[PDB]
Every structure is written in structure tokens, then in C-alpha cells.
Amino acid sequence: IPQTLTNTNLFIDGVSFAGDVPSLTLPKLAVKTEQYRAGGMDAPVSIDMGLEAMEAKFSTNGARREALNFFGLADQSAFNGVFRGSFKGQKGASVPVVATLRGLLKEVDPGDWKAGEKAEFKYAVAVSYYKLEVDGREVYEIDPVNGVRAINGVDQLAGMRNDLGL
């Protein structure tokens, strides 16, 4: 069934942004591949080295003071945050995609104020904790603190934590 995004939303502390956020971006989850070609093989094989640095953009076209007051404060991972998105589909009922993203607020980039255009305050979140849910059930859970990278319920770093004595 063809399925496409229809609406988005953004919560921080339960403070809703109903008609305030035009664009938001989930973090690009990229695994750290290194092209490994040893002796006895012609092509490189990529290998896991953990994940990359997660990075979450979102944007607001107005000064809200609920997204501005979480920039650069001394408590890292104080921006709690919830990215929501409803994927409708062709046959009626939708599928909710909920992601919570506990990190620090990296930058605030107000663009050019050209007196007759949109404000477009860029934001960026340096994600520490990340948990993607699709249709009310867990897909991802990324927290490098304690190392609990989990795919659809099972924990993929359960092997190394017994190896590292964690």
C-alpha cells in the first residue's frame, strides 16, 4: 500500500508546536563503515565501528522562546523533545511515527531578515538519546551512554557489554 507523510508535529516539554514548525529532520543514523580489504580478497568489505554522530535539524518561522531557551545551557541533554509524524497511506487509517530525541541544542541560525519573507529560525540538536517508534511499537533505541543500541526490541550491543565488563 502506498504510504506518504501528511502532517508533522513537535513537542518539547509537552509545549506543543501545532502551527509553528514548518520543517523538522530526524537524525541520519549512519553506521561507521571502514572499507576493509585484507589479503585474499579483491573487494573491500565494510565493517561496523558503532554509529556516527546523530544530528537533528528542526525549524521555526517565529520567535517562540520555548525553543530558544534551551540553547547552550550547561546541562547537556536537557532538550528532551518529541518528533511526531503521521503517515497516512492510501486506504484510510494512518501510522504514527514518534521519535524522542534527548540531546543538546547545538545551534540557532536565524537566516536573512529581508522584510517581507519568512523568518526561518534554523535549529540543530546534537542527539544523545534517540528512540524511533513506528505504529506504536519500538524500532530503534540509541543511547551511547551505557551502550544500548537496540533494533526492534533486541539489544545489539549485548555481546560487547559482556566483553567489556559493562
Binding site: 513537542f11 509537552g14 528532551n80 543511547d143
Partner: protein
């Protein structure tokens, strides 16, 4: 008038051991003499910071300060300490240390420890009354005040033998009581002799010490005691399942003191008839992960229930529990909203339910070492 320039005085002060972890608070109650140097009314609580204001609120020779010096010898915590006027008959002294609502609109005796918060911002989690806990009627009022306060109430025993201390612990079993029977005798510098301290303040200063860097999840059942000499009665742990004096008192759920001159404490288990709430750690962890949550959730009460109200706090209960796994307080947990108890009829009266089912670290009360002398590596000697 005033002074200009440096005025060099000459005072008497002790060591600079006043560095204060605000982790555990102690509720204390004992007799004293309200003299001119003791700036404390009898039935009111007084927050104590060190020995310097424990000597200012109460006298040097007062029985408060003898039971308050023992706490600050080990841990420099803060103490919500109430006093009581001494009495002639021991029944009126036992009735005064309990106290109650016999004032106009005040609480007297142990009941003034319920006024820890909203007067001092320190709700006492360690309840002691050294010497008075050997009485039955005081320890029952010490019992019932602990479930109202979610606290560990440290009891005592008599000076007599082990049989009269086991018999004092049989009528209890109410999951909050921690009994230490051997009378800790301690040297003093006033009369140059050996006193007999009733063992409560040393365990109270040890529960507040192990919360400073070992955490509340850890067990204070093999920890050291400072400012101490021997016990009134010897009690030792040996091996071989014989009539050990320690094993006879551990099986009666009573803590002892093992090594030389008051060197260790020895009890893991509360006076509890329920087998689930045996250890002191499970009773403390269930009582001290909740104030670590209910503080940090001064909100989520009288706010107003939105659509994602339940979701935004059950993701905040998890975030205030993952750091408890990070600092080693718990082993793996689960926090989830209760699906069947949460309903639309419960929202109209403000009732919302969660499930914070977790587990805790069990204290290793029995490390067994299975050992023999083989002759296997005898071919190494050639």
C-alpha cells in the same frame, strides 16, 4: 563600637571536616537539660549542621550531644533533632519521648520529626532514639512513625545476653526496623573512662555515610565505624554452622558488631516477617528511588491532563531511571502506563496510573568459596 585593622583572636575549633553531602537526614530524639547554653526549646525540632551547632543548640554533657557526636564522627550529614525533657519515672520518660498532639497545635516527642519538611526541608529517613528504643512502647511508636515517613527506624536491644535480645525481636517483624543489640562502649575525654553508648547513632551515622559515595543501593553491612571502642558483649562470626554469636543474631534478624573495638557492622536484614522485604537494601531502594523521582516530579500533579500528558511523563520516568542504571542503583527496569486502570472515568477525578516495575541489586551476604588442597600441580616441582 567597631575595629579597624587586623584583630587576631584566640579560639578553640576542631578539624575542618565540615564538608557536607546533603544525601541522608537523621531523625533523633533523646533527653537533655534546657540550660542557658542550650539554645533550644524542648519539643521543637532543631536542624543540626555539625558539632559546632550541636554544641550550641544543646549542651556538652547533654544526652543529645553524646548521641549526636557519634553521628558526626563518621558522616557529616544534617540531623533533624528533637529534644525531650527528662522525667523521673521511666514510664513517664517513655511517654514523653513518644509525645503526640498533647500540645495546643503542635507535635511533641517523636511526632515532631513528622514536621521535618515544611519547617526544615529535610524529611528524616533515619529514625533513632538511643537507649529509648530498648523499651517496647517507644519502639512501637518508632515503628508506626516510620511507615508514615517512609524511613528506616534503627532500634536497640538491652544490655543483657543474646537470649533476651532475640526475644525482643520476635514481637516485631514490620519491614522497617533495624535492630543492633550489642552495647557499644566508647572512650571519652571528660571523665577519662569508658561510656556505654546504645549503638543507634553509630549505625545512623553509618547509613548516612554509605549514601554519600557508595549510594543508597549499597549495603552498609560490612562498613567501618569511627570513634569507637569495643562492645559490651563479645560477638564474633566463625564458620562451621555451630552456635556462633553472630549467626544466632543474624537468624533473629539483628545486626551485630564483629571485629576489634567496634570495627564493623554486620546486619543486612530488617525485622520483617515478610520474606520479600528482608534485606535493608530492598526496603531502602524502594523508599529512595521514589523521592529521587517525586523530586524531579514536583510537576505532573495539579497540571492538567492533555492528550499526550501520560506519554510525556512516562518518557520522563524512564529518563530519570536510566541514570539510576548508569550509577548502578538498579538492574534492568521497565516503566509503562497501566493500560486497563487508566480510563476516561478516572481522568474526571484526576487519577492516572503507571507501572514502575524494577529490580535491585541483592547484597552479597554469603560469598561461598569452595576450596580444596589438590595434588594436581605437583609435577611442577621437579
Amino acid at each position: 563600637s567597631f575595629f579597624h585593622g587586623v584583630t587576631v583572636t584566640n579560639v578553640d575549633i576542631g578539624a575542618r571536616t565540615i564538608a557536607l553531602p546533603a544525601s541522608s537526614v537523621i531523625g533523633l530524639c533523646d533527653v537533655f537539660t534546657p540550660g542557658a547554653q542550650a539554645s533550644a526549646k524542648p519539643n521543637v525540632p532543631v536542624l543540626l549542621t555539625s558539632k559546632k551547632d550541636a554544641a550550641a543548640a544543646f549542651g556538652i554533657g547533654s544526652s543529645i550531644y553524646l548521641a549526636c557526636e557519634a553521628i558526626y564522627n563518621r558522616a557529616q550529614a544534617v540531623i533533624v533533632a528533637v529534644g525531650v525533657e527528662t522525667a523521673e519515672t521511666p514510664e513517664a520518660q517513655a511517654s514523653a519521648v513518644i509525645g503526640g498532639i498533647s500540645a495546643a497545635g503542635e507535635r511533641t516527642g517523636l511526632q515532631a520529626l513528622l514536621d521535618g519538611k515544611s519547617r526544615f526541608n529535610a524529611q528524616p529517613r533515619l529514625l533513632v532514639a538511643p537507649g529509648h528504643s530498648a523499651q517496647q512502647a517507644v519502639a512501637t511508636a518508632m515503628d508506626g512513625l516510620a511507615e508514615k515517613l517512609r524511613a528506616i527506624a534503627i532500634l536497640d536491644g538491652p544490655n543483657s545476653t543474646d537470649e533476651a535480645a532475640v526475644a525482643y525481636a520476635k514481637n516485631f517483624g514490620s519491614k522497617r526496623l533495624f535492630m543492633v543489640d550489642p552495647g557499644v562502649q566508647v572512650w571519652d575525654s571528660a571523665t577519662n573512662a569508658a561510656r556505654n553508648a546504645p549503638a543507634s547513632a553509630y549505625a545512623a551515622g553509618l547509613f548516612a555515610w554509605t549514601d554519600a559515595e557508595y549510594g543508597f543501593w549499597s549495603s552498609p553491612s560490612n562498613k567501618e565505624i569511627k570513634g569507637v571502642t569495643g562492645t559490651s558483649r563479645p560477638v564474633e562470626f566463625l564458620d562451621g554452622d555451630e552456635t556462633c554469636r553472630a549467626n544466632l543474631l543474624n537468624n533473629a534478624n539483628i545486626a551485630t558488631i564483629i571485629r576489634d573495638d567496634g570495627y564493623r557492622l554486620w546486619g543486612n536484614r530488617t525485622l520483617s516477617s515478610d520474606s520479600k522485604w528482608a534485606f535493608v537494601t530492598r526496603v531502602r531502594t524502594m523508599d529512595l528511588v521514589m523521592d529521587a523521582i517525586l523530586a524531579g516530579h514536583k510537576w505532573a500533579v495539579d497540571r492538567g491532563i492533555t492528550k499526550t500528558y501520560v506519554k510525556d511523563v512516562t518518557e520522563g520516568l524512564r529518563a530519570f531511571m536510566r541514570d539510576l542504571k548508569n550509577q548502578g542503583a538498579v538492574i534492568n527496569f521497565e516503566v509503562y502506563a497501566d493500560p486497563d486502570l487508566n480510563s476516561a472515568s478516572q481522568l474526571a477525578q484526576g487519577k492516572v496510573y503507571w507501572n514502575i516495575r524494577f529490580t535491585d541489586v541483592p547484597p552479597a551476604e554469603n560469598p561461598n568459596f569452595r576450596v580444596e588442597v589438590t595434588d594436581q600441580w605437583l609435577t611442577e616441582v621437579l
